[PDB]
C-alpha cells in the first residue's frame, strides 16, 4: 500500500519545547497495550531502498522545521519556464527569529484503519533480502527525528552484531549504512568562558569528546565486517573529499546551535588487522555557524546568533554513514570516506524493519467440485 500513517508520540502539551508543541497539534498518544502477532513460516521480500514509507517521514519532518526554526532570511531559488538564459531569480522571505528550545522526541508511525505493518525479526536481515521471522504489528518502535550527517545520532542499536547495509556494493554510488551494536557516547559543550565576539575589525567555538578506549572497539568490528566483503584489499579510512560544509564535517543541532564538528581526527587512520591510532578524550573541534544550507531543498538560510552559554549535547552514536572510493586506480585498497547528507538515507536506517501491506481476501484455486445447474 501507499497510504498515510498517523504518528503517535508521547507528548507533554505544556512546555515550550518545540517537539512537544508539534506533537500535541498533530500526533495521538502512544498505544499503552501493543500487540505483536508472530506469524508462522512466512517469507516476505523486504525491499528497503524502494520503501515508500520513508518518503512520508521525510515529508512529515520538513513540515516540522517550518514550525520550529523560522529563518531570518530564507533565500531559495525559483526559476521561470523559459527554454534554453533561463529566468531564475531568488525569492527571499524575512521572518521573526525567536531562539526556541530544541529536543527530539520518539515518535511511532502507526498503520491506518484497514492496513497492517509487517516487521522482520532476523538479527542480520541483510537489507533487501527476504527474512523468515516476520511478525505483524500496528505501530513502529521509538523513532527520533534527529537530523545529522556522517554519524547517525540517538536511536536504536543492533541486536547482536554490527551489520552493514547498502543497496548495492562495488558500484561506489550508494551509501553504506553501518549500524553499531554498542552505544558510542559523545559529549559536546561550551560552558561560558569565550565571550570574545570578534578578533579584529571565541563565542563561535565548541568541542566534543569521544572515548578512544571505547570507540576503537566498535571501529575494530567494522573493519572486521568490511574485510569480509574484500579480503585481499586494504581498509583505509580517510576524511571527506570536499563539497559543502554540511557534508565535509559533522553537523547536528542543539537548541539552534548548528555545530559543524571537524571529524578529521577520527577517520585519518589507515587500517589492517592491527591498529594505527595510538598506544581517551579526542578533542573534536566544533564551530557554531550562522549561514547554513538547508537540507529540506536547495537554498541558503541565516539564523539568529548563538546563545550566551551552557550548551550541552549528551548524545549517543548508533550508526555511521560511509561511502566508498572504487575504480581502476584502486591498487588493492578500500577507501571509506564519510558521507551522508541525504536525510532519506538517515531514516532508511531506522525504517528498515517495517513495510505497509494491505490484506486482499479473494482467491482462486482449482478443485473437484461443480456447481449443480
Amino acid at each position, epitope marked *: 500500500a501507499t497510504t498515510t500513517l498517523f504518528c503517535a508520540s508521547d507528548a507533554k502539551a505544556y512546555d515550550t519545547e518545540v517537539h512537544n508543541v508539534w506533537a500535541t497539534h498533530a500526533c495521538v498518544p502512544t498505544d499503552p497495550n501493543p500487540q505483536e502477532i508472530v506469524l508462522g513460516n512466512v517469507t516476505e521480500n523486504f525491499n528497503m531502498w524502494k520503501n515508500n514509507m520513508v518518503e512520508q517521514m521525510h515529508e512529515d519532518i520538513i513540515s516540522l522545521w517550518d514550525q520550529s526554526l523560522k529563518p531570518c*532570511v530564507k533565500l531559495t531559488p525559483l526559476c521561470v519556464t523559459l527554454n534554453c538564459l533561463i529566468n531564475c531569480n531568488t525569492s527571499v522571505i524575512t521572518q521573526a527569529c525567536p531562539k526556541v528550545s530544541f529536543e527530539p522526541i520518539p515518535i511511532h508511525y502507526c498503520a491506518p484503519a484497514g492496513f497492517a505493518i509487517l516487521k522482520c525479526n532476523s538479527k542480520t536481515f541483510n537489507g533487501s533480502g527476504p527474512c523468515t521471522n516476520v511478525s505483524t504489528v500496528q505501530c513502529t518502535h521509538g523513532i527520533r527525528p534527529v537530523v545529522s550527517t556522517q554519524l547517525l545520532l540517538n536511536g536504536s542499536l543492533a541486536e547482536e552484531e554490527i551489520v552493514i547495509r547498502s543497496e548495492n556494493i562495488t558500484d561506489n554510488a550508494k551509501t553504506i549504512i553501518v549500524q553499531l551494536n554498542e552505544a558510542v557516547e559523545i559529549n559536546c559543550t561550551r560552558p561560558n568562558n569565550n565571550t570574545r565576539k570578534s578578533i579584529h575589525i571565541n563565542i563561535r567555538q565548541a568541542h566534543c569528546n569521544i572515548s578512544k578506549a571505547r570507540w576503537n572497539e566498535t571501529l575494530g568490528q567494522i573493519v572486521a565486517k568490511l574485510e569480509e566483503q574484500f579480503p585481499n584489499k586494504t581498509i583505509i579510512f580517510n576524511h571527506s573529499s570536499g563539497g559543502d560544509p554540511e557534508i565535509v564535517t559533522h553537523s547536528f543541532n542543539c537548541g539552534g546551535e548548528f555545530f559543524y564538528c571537524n571529524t578529521t581526527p577520527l577517520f585519518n587512520s589507515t587500517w589492517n588487522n592491527t591498529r594505527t591510532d595510538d598506544y581517551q578524550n579526542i578533542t573534536l573541534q566544533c564551530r557554531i555557524k550562522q*549561514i547554513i544550507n538547508m537540507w529540506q531543498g536547495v537554498g541558503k538560510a541565516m539564523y539568529a*546568533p548563538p546563545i550566551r552559554g551552557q550548551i550541552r549535547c549528551s548524545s549517543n552514536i548508533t550508526g555511521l554513514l560511509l561511502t566508498r572510493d572504487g575504480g581502476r586506480d584502486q591498487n588493492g585498497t578500500e577507501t571509506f570516506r564519510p558521507g551522508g547528507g541525504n536525510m532519506r538515507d538517515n531514516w532508511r536506517s531506522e525504517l528498515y524493519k517495517y513495510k505497509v501491506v494491505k490484506i486482499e481476501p479473494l482467491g482462486i484455486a482449482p478443485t473437484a467440485c461443480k456447481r449443480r445447474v
Partner: antibody
Amino acid sequence: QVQLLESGAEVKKPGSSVKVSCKASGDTFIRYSFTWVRQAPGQGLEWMGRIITILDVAHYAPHLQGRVTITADKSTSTVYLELRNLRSDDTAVYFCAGVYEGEADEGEYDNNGFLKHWGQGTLVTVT
Amino acid sequence: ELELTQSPATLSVSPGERATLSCRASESVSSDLAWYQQKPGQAPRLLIYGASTRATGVPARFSGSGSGAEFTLTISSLQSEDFAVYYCQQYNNWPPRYTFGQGTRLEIKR
C-alpha cells in the same frame, strides 16, 4: 582597515533618478554588511536601508521601499543606491556606512546592527 | 514603528565637568542600543555598541548603561574635542524597521 569613497555631489531636478556609489578596500567586500543613513540639513540621522553582501537582500523603511534599491557589485566592490522618484523632501546628504562581521564567508556571521565605519557624504539637492 | 525620545534639547556643560544623557524608547528594547557622536561636516563616529562595550578607539571618558526604556550615558572629564552632537539609534526589530532618534548637543555659555 577599511575605507570608503563616496560619489560626486550632484544636484538633480525632483522627479528623476539618483545613483550614489561607494568603493572600499582593506578587506574583502563580501566579508560584512553595509547600510545607508540620510543626513538632512538641520535634521537628525534618518535610516535609509541595510544590505548584506553575501545574501543579496535589503530591508528599508516603509516610506522609501517604492523609491530605493541597493545593489552590491562585488566584482567591483561598489555599493549602489538607485533612488528614483525624487521629491523635494529628499534633499539631504547621503553616505555609505559599514560594520565588520566575523568570517561571514565560512558562516561565522554575527548580524551586527550597529554602525562603525562611515564614508564622508555626497550632497543631494533638488531645485 | 518605534520612536526614540531625548529628555533635553541641548546640554549645559563646561570643560572639566561631568555630563550625562538619557535616551527613552517609545516601546520596549533590550541592550541593543548604540550611542553615536556627531561633529559638523564630519562622520558620525561610533561611541558605544550594545550600550556597554566601547569601540576600537573610544576613550575611557565615555561610558553608559541602562536597559529597557531608560538608557544612561556618562562623560567623565569633558575635553575640548568632546563637544559634539550625540545621537541615539535603536536596532532591535527584525525585519529592520528602526528609524531614528532626536539627539542632544553640548552648550557654550554666551
